[PDB]
């Protein structure tokens, strides 16, 4: 039951450990996981924000969604050309889709994503230049053997897996309290049904649409309030409280499949052989590291 409709899904604020201000923060973009299994250095990134979809949720390339940490905590939309991925230098954005990115990146010890004009977020991830064969190279040469390797697909409609999705739980806003003169109240935004479950003197659960006096809460530290109409799905990140019902409401695709392909690997200098009795002396030339494997053609 894989769904490709993103109108039923909202982005989420993710708590990540290294923001731009060198401290953990809640960010609209949060790196959940990074996979580097392709043989061309392309990395796939799971980000708390969606990509290639507009605020409503329709397929709109070059505009992306994010849940903002401003006063109006709702989904906002922004241009995709002001987003950067980098490890040590900037990364070439190979592809994007909802919750997912794919990019060529230089070697480095960290992977970070930022929304320029900044909201950068960084995770530890050791990525290096990778082989395909038995000879080391920076880039494949014009003369080679064209061996079979596996690279991430740049087409977004393929599926390398699936992510389960769940309904979002309570969020318990702080801006819904009116502690004043020893008595507390609720701030409903524009008459919405922001509910409350809180323990002035005992467990009292209700739903208010207007500003409401509380029976026994003296301070505001022992009573909370949150929105109720939240029927937009969310990824099961460890940065949100699960609801009482935490079943798999839907499943989203994991794009950028590890598709097999051909890719060229170099051919080293052909060694010269000098023949001496029961043995050969091979004279070896290799600018880059190159594997030599010998085996006897017998029992041992």
């Amino acid at each position: 039951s894989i769904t490709d409709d993103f109108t039923l899904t909202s982005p989420y604020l993710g708590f990540c450990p290294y923001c731009r201000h060198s401290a953990p923060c809640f960010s609209p973009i949060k790196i959940e996981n990074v996979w580097d299994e392709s043989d061309d250095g392309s990395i796939r990134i799971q980000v708390s924000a969606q990509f290639g979809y507009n605020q409503a949720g329709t397929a709109d390339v070059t505009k992306f969604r994010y849940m903002s940490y401003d006063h109006d905590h709702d989904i906002k939309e922004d241009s995709m050309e002001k987003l950067a991925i980098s490890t040590s230098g900037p990364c070439r954005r190979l592809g994007h889709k909802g919750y997912f990115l794919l990019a060529q990146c230089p070697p480095g010890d960290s992977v970070t994503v930022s929304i320029t004009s900044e909201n950068s977020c960084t995770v530890e991830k050791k990525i290096r230049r990778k082989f395909v064969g038995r000879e080391e190279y920076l880039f494949p040469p014009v003369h080679g053997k064209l061996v079979k390797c596996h690279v991430y697909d740049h087409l977004k409609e393929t599926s390398a897996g699936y992510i389960t999705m769940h309904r979002p739980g309570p969020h318990a806003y702080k801006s819904y309290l009116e502690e004043a003169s020893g008595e507390v109240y609720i701030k409903p935004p524009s008459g919405k049904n922001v509910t409350y479950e809180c323990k002035c003197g005992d467990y009292s659960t209700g739903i208010v649409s207007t500003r409401t006096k509380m029976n026994g809460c003296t301070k505001a530290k022992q009573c909370i309030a949150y929105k109720r109409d939240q029927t937009k799905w969310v990824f099961n990140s460890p940065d949100l409280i699960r609801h009482t019902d935490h079943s798999v409401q839907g499943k989203l695709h994991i794009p950028f499949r590890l598709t097999p392909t051909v890719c060229p690997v170099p051919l080293a200098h052909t060694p010269t052989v000098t023949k001496w009795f029961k043995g050969i002396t091979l004279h070896l030339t290799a600018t880059r590291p190159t594997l030599l494997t010998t085996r006897k053609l017998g029992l041992r």
């Binding site: 708590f15 953990p24 460890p238 940065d239 085996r295 006897k296 053609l297 017998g298 029992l299 041992r300």
Partner: protein, 97 residues
Amino acid sequence: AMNPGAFGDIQASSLDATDIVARTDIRLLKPSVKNIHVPYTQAVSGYEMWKNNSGRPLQETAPFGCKIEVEPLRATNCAYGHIPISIDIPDAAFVRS
């Protein structure tokens, strides 16, 4: 039988099997900072630790110099012994003395 940080740490009958079994040394820890994250620590995958020191495969370390192929698993062109052949030549090739 599984060991953390060793090959076969996570096993299943198939790739898409529901009955996944693993014994990775995973421990949950108390959240020190007042947030909603799940702090956990876990032993490194034994798959990567096996790829680190897998040694050389059977395509390079094999007696009698014959090459290993997969789908199906086989060792082609091996040269070690002798085959007894009992061959019945048809009489159309046998000619009068």
